[PDB]
Scaffold this active site. Structure first.
Site, mmCIF file in Angstrom:
data_model
loop_
_atom_site.group_PDB
_atom_site.id
_atom_site.type_symbol
_atom_site.label_atom_id
_atom_site.label_comp_id
_atom_site.label_asym_id
_atom_site.label_seq_id
_atom_site.Cartn_x
_atom_site.Cartn_y
_atom_site.Cartn_z
ATOM 1 N N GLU A 1 -3.576 0.553 -2.948
ATOM 2 C CA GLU A 1 -3.220 -0.836 -2.471
ATOM 3 C C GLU A 1 -3.088 -1.803 -3.365
ATOM 4 O OE1 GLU A 1 -6.139 -2.279 0.741
ATOM 5 O OE2 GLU A 1 -4.569 -2.188 2.049
ATOM 6 N N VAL A 2 -2.135 -2.811 -3.290
ATOM 7 C CA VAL A 2 -1.825 -3.570 -4.461
ATOM 8 C C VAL A 2 -1.639 -4.884 -3.894
ATOM 9 C CG1 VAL A 2 0.116 -4.104 -6.039
ATOM 10 C CG2 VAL A 2 -0.304 -1.756 -5.868
ATOM 11 N N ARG B 1 0.865 -0.974 0.102
ATOM 12 C CA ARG B 1 -0.084 -0.027 -0.112
ATOM 13 C C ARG B 1 0.915 1.106 0.120
ATOM 14 N NH1 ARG B 1 -4.304 -0.462 4.182
ATOM 15 N NH2 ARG B 1 -2.658 0.794 5.650
ATOM 16 N N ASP C 1 8.343 9.486 -12.274
ATOM 17 C CA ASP C 1 8.529 8.820 -10.957
ATOM 18 C C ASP C 1 9.358 7.494 -11.108
ATOM 19 O OD1 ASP C 1 8.340 8.414 -8.265
ATOM 20 O OD2 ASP C 1 6.456 7.307 -8.437
#
Ligand SMILES: CCc1ccccc1-c1c(Cl)cc(CN)cc1Cl
Ligand SMILES: CCc1ccccc1-c1c(Cl)cc(CN)cc1Cl
Length: 327
Positions: free
Chosen positions: A50-51, A45, A154
Site C-alpha cells: 500500500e503506497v 494499493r 517489471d
C-alpha cells in the site's frame, strides 16, 4: 534439454563484487524511526504493498511510503538490498529510510517524493522530441542497474514516474528486481502481461537484463504508434500469438530452435503461420508525427525474439534516434 544462455554484457558484475553485495539474505536492515513520518493520503494499493504520500516531520519534506504486505521474507530483503545498491544511480528512485509500520508490523520503505504528472496527459501530449528525451533517461536507469548486476523485470509505464514540469524521471518499484547470476534459472512469472518478453512466454528460465529491453520496446511501440498496449494479449498464450502476428512465426521457431525450447502443445490450436510485418504497416495519419526512420530502426533492434540479439541499454544510448536529444 534447453541450451544454456548467458548475457553478452555484465556477466561478471556479481563475481567481481563481494558476497555481501548480492547475498541479500545475509543483509542486516538498519531500522529508522517510524515516528519521523506522518501519513497524509493513500495513493494506491497493489498485490504487494500500500503506497502513501507522507511528511518527514524532522525536516518537513514530502516522501512516499510503501507499506509492504506480509510476503516471503526473501522478497523484502531482496528489494531493500537492490534499492541500497542502486541508491544515487541516474534516474533510480532514492530509498530514504526503512521503518517498521506500527499497524501492519511490516517494513515500510520511505522514498523521495516525485510529483508524477498525469499518465493520460503524458501519453496524449508528449512530443516526438519528449519521447526521445524520456526514453534516453530510462536507458540511463537501465544501463546503471544492469551494470550493477541487477535486472528490473517489471519495466512498464506505471513503474516510470515522470515529473514533466521539472523534466525529471524515476524508475520505481524494484519489488520484482533480481541479481543477475550467469547460469541461474529464474521464475518466468515476472513483468505485467503486455510487457512480458518472449523468453518468459515460452518458459525459458535462463534469461537476463535483456528482458528489460523487450519491455522498453513494448513501451516505445505503444507510444509512437498510438496503440496501447502494443501487444494486447487476452492471456499469456494469446500474448505470444499477438507478438507472432507482428514478428512472424518463422523467427519465433528459429528462436525456440536455437535454445532447444519446445513450445507448450496448447499453441498448436492458436499460433498459426504469420509472416513478419514491416514496421511501416503500423503508421497512420494519427501517429505519423511520432514516427521516423530512426524510431523504427531503434524499435526493430529492441523487439527481437532472441534475447541475445537485442540492443543492450548502453548500445541503445548511441542510436541515431537520440541524436536530437540535448545532452
Ligand atoms: C507509454 C510509455 C512511454 C513511452 C515513451 C516515453 C514515455 C512513456 C511514459 C512513461 Cl515511461 C511513463 C509515464 C507515466 N507513468 C507516461 C509515459 Cl507517456
Ligand atoms: C494442427 C495445426 Cl493446424 C497446427 C499445428 C502446429 N504445427 C499442429 C496441429 Cl496438430
Amino acid at each position: 534439454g534447453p541450451v544454456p544462455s548467458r548475457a553478452r554484457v555484465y556477466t561478471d558484475v556479481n563475481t567481481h563484487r563481494p558476497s555481501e553485495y548480492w547475498d541479500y539474505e545475509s543483509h542486516v536492515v538498519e531500522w529508522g524511526n517510524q515516528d519521523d513520518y506522518q501519513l497524509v493520503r493513500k495513493l494506491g494499493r497493489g498485490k504487494y504493498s500500500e503506497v502513501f504520500e507522507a511528511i518527514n516531520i524532522t525536516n518537513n519534506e514530502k516522501v512516499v511510503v510503501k507499506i509492504l504486505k506480509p510476503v516471503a521474507a526473501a522478497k523484502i530483503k531482496r528489494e531493500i538490498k537492490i534499492l541500497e545498491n542502486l541508491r544515487g544511480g541516474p534516474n533510480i528512485i532514492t530509498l530514504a529510510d526503512i521503518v517498521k509500520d506500527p499497524v501492519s508490523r511490516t517494513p515500510a520503505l520511505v522514498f523521495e517524493h516525485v510529483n508524477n504528472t498525469d499518465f493520460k496527459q503524458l501519453y496524449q501530449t508528449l512530443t516526438d522530441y519528449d519521447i526521445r528525451f524520456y526514453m534516453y533517461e530510462i536507458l540511463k536507469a537501465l544501463d546503471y542497474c544492469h551494470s550493477m548486476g541487477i535486472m528490473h523485470r517489471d519495466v512498464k509505464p506505471h513503474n516510470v514516474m515522470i515529473d514533466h514540469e521539472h523534466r525529471k524521471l524515476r524508475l520505481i518499484d524494484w519489488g520484482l528486481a533480481e541479481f543477475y547470476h550467469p547460469g541461474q534459472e529464474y521464475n518466468v512469472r515476472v513483468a505485467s502481461r503486455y510487457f512480458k518478453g518472449p523468453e518468459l512466454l515460452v518458459d525459458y528460465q535462463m534469461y537476463d537484463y535483456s528482458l528489460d529491453m523487450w519491455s522498453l520496446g513494448c513501451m516505445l511501440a505503444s507510444m509512437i504508434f498510438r496503440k496501447e498496449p502494443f501487444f494486447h494479449g487476452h492471456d499469456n498464450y494469446d500474448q505470444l500469438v499477438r507478438i507472432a502476428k507482428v514478428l512472424g512465426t518463422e523467427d519465433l521457431y528459429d528462436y525456440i530452435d536455437k535454445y532447444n525450447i519446445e513450445l507448450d502443445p496448447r499453441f498448436n490450436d492458436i499460433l498459426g503461420r504469420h509472416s513478419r510485418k514491416r514496421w511501416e504497416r503500423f503508421v497512420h495519419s494519427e501517429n505519423q508525427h511520432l514516427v521516423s526512420p530512426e524510431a523504427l530502426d531503434f524499435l526493430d533492434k529492441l523487439l527481437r525474439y532472441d534475447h541475445q540479439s537485442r540492443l543492450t541499454a548502453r548500445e541503445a544510448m548511441e542510436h541515431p534516434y537520440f541524436y536530437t536529444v540535448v545532452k
